[PDB]
Amino acid sequence: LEVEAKLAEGRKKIEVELQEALGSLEQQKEDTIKSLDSQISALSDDIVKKVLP
Amino acid sequence: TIRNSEELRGKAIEQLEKARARLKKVEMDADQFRVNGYSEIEREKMNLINSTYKTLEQFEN
């Protein structure tokens, strides 16, 4: 029981850790999407010079 | 008649004493069994927690 209940609580703690990590990653991804805009612009220009002959 | 009662009493006491000696021994086996079981239960509990912590970490992965 006691070990089992402890394990269940540990599983909940792991879920909290995992739930939080995903949220942090999502926030980071949003910032990146906001960030490195020049790549976007220049990145856009990117294909253009090589797409055609 | 005399040789009978004595034998009964001899055999009888050999047997009550023997039975109670066996009780003691068992009292010993059980005593042993209880300790082993307790240790096994603790290890098993340890098993569960450890492995579930592993499962957590894999979930995090």
- Sequence letter at residue A48: V
Residues of chain B with Cβ-Cβ distance to A4 below 8 Å are: 45, 48
Q: How far apart are CA A20 and CA A31, in angstroms?
A: 17
Question: Distance between CA A22 and CA A15 in Å, rounded?
Answer: 10
Experimental technique for the deposited model: cryo-EM
Q: Give B41→chain A minimum CA distance, Å.
A: 10
Provide long-range contacts, Cβ within 8 A and 24+ apart, for A15-19.
A15/B59, A17/B56, A17/B60, A18/B56, A18/B59, A18/B60
Q: What is the dihedral angle through the alpha carbons of B41, B42, B47, B48, rounded to the nearest 10 degrees?
A: 80
How far is it, in rounded angstroms, from Cα B11 to Cα B8?
Answer: 5
Lookup: tokens for B8:
């009964």
SS3 B40: helix
How far is Cα A13 from Cα B46, in angstroms, rounded to an integer? Answer: 18
Interface test with B, best of A1, A4, A7 (most B CBs within 10 A): A7
DSSP, res A1: -
Resolution of the experimental model, in Å, one decimal: 4.2
Full DSSP string of A31-50: HHHHS-HHHHHHHHHHHHHH
Count of C-beta atoms within a 10 Å radius of residue B56: 19
Distance from CA of A15 to the nearest CA of B (A): 8
Residue type, B4: N
